[PDB]
Design an enzyme around this catalytic site. Sequence first.
Site, PDB file in Angstrom:
ATOM      1  N   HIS A 136       0.802  -1.225   0.000  1.00  0.00           N
ATOM      2  CA  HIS A 136       0.000   0.000   0.000  1.00  0.00           C
ATOM      3  C   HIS A 136       0.841   1.284   0.000  1.00  0.00           C
ATOM      4  O   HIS A 136       0.237   2.374  -0.072  1.00  0.00           O
ATOM      5  CB  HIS A 136      -1.053   0.032   1.126  1.00  0.00           C
ATOM      6  CG  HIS A 136      -0.528   0.294   2.489  1.00  0.00           C
ATOM      7  ND1 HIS A 136      -0.286  -0.712   3.386  1.00  0.00           N
ATOM      8  CD2 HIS A 136      -0.320   1.458   3.156  1.00  0.00           C
ATOM      9  CE1 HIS A 136       0.143  -0.194   4.537  1.00  0.00           C
ATOM     10  NE2 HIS A 136       0.141   1.126   4.417  1.00  0.00           N
ATOM     11  N   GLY A 138       3.987   5.726  10.038  1.00  0.00           N
ATOM     12  CA  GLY A 138       5.342   5.570   9.484  1.00  0.00           C
ATOM     13  C   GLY A 138       5.987   4.246   9.871  1.00  0.00           C
ATOM     14  O   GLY A 138       7.096   3.993   9.399  1.00  0.00           O
ATOM     15  N   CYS A 183       4.792   1.268   9.217  1.00  0.00           N
ATOM     16  CA  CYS A 183       4.495   0.160   8.280  1.00  0.00           C
ATOM     17  C   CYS A 183       5.804  -0.327   7.666  1.00  0.00           C
ATOM     18  O   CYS A 183       6.663   0.495   7.358  1.00  0.00           O
ATOM     19  CB  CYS A 183       3.518   0.583   7.218  1.00  0.00           C
ATOM     20  SG  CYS A 183       1.933   1.171   7.873  1.00  0.00           S
TER      21      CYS A 183
END
EC number: 3.4.19.12
Lengths: 306, 306
Positions: free
Chosen positions: B41, B143, B145
Amino acid sequence: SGFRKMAFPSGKVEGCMVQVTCGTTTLNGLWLDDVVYCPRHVICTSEDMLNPNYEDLLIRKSNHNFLVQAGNVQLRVIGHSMQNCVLKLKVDTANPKTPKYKFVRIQPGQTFSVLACYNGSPSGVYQCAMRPNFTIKGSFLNGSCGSVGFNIDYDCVSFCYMHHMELPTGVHAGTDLEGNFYGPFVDRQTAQAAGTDTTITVNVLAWLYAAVINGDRWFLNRFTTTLNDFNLVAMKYNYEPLTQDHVDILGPLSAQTGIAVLDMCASLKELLQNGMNGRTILGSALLEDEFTPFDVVRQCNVATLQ
Amino acid sequence: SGFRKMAFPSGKVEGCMVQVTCGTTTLNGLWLDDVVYCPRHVICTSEDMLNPNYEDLLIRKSNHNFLVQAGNVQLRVIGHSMQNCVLKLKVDTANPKTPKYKFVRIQPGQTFSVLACYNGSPSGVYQCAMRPNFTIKGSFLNGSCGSVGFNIDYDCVSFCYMHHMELPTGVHAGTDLEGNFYGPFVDRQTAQAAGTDTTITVNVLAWLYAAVINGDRWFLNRFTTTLNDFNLVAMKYNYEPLTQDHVDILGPLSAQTGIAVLDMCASLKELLQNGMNGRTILGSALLEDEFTPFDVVRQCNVATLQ
Ligand code: NA
């Protein structure tokens, strides 16, 4: 979201851990530039540990008595000396993985990361707080001596603890990296008398703010108290006195939540007096005191302005 | 002595963390050999995230749309592909710090270390367990991820988790390193309630054994129970069923303490029906379920024969 006991990433320290053997004793040392630091009781026999004459014992040793292993490589010891309870072995090779570092002496209540090592090899990492009685509640087995504690401050590794001993009550004692013990303890087999431990009040308040930032609000009351009245109640529960300096360092968290520190103190007072109602706060059924105000600021991103 | 939630030393993984930017989205990636793995994503706009067709989104992307930074060094992207929910970016340079590694898919109840990262920079490390509902109770901010979970087997890093999402309840969800989510979750802004979380019974029993090995024995009793009568009680309290396989994996701890698993189950049955009545176990006022039987074996030095 979330709140967890978090340690610093340990890589910069892992690259400094070595194994030190003297005689039949093996423990860990910290290799920074051309010096390995380790607990001096590596030089003791069982008899020596009952009544060690460390100054004489070190004179009797020679460089060849110290076997220093950095992974698969033996480091040649070319000098030795002692600073308080730390042995300093000079080696003929500087560690190319030495990080920018400093030695610091921490205060009770402050937190640090412990890199538990065995045989010169890092094994696990966990966060610890220096207790008001200068012990740490760690997890350590035989062979852990020489493990170190540290914080990462900007671009610098701040070493604050070297592990030396487990007291018979199962808590742990050690030195700073100048070899001075935290607390009234000695590196020998003798009665060691820790103070009564107490709860780190400023840290509990910080953790209650972390709970609020994370949406866990049930324990808040609308009351507020005075610093003096709060301290009269809390000290009945074996809590450390809260000082104006403590109030000040909680300021970023009171600002973020809009809950005055003395309003939170009245909420903590009610928890102490009436208990936790069979409920949890941040996943705990007890009040947690091993998180500093800055630990909460960093994990909850409190210091941003927008 | 002592028992603490402990993570693996993180250095082998720190050497693999990079920053990946696509458009204005920045997150973390894992650089192993000449591939960088990250959540797919990263290619989404805000509109796309509501209803993404990832195959179509990825067709319009070119290698030059992916900025990969390792330190202050850009890595040239020379290919890109998608495996389930993970993007794989081929780079022109193999990571010289790649450890021995494998990708594994873990079970609920199993513990692992999380290296939380931001901007490709490791920030902290903590241990967590995969919950029976396939969520993790982590500590993550915007942040994070791309942060990964892992276990270490001496020299081999077993990667088991890549972070993708926080649910609105504040718990976390992610994939294995083949890109398959744990649990019924999707990388889209859409409703996706987790199942009921339950307590990991076999881990609670392991932790009670840790307590006994560390000297906490107050909860042991003279009651007895069969496995089925134990499960009839435990299921009333949202505990997972205990099977004979669980009884076997507790074998090393029942052997070390001389306490049969079903006798420990009778202690647990009484704690569940009645609470701890103002007492603690290993410093906690609740029944802890995020330590596996092997976590206990390793901290309690159970796997030695002498
Ligand atoms: Na209040």
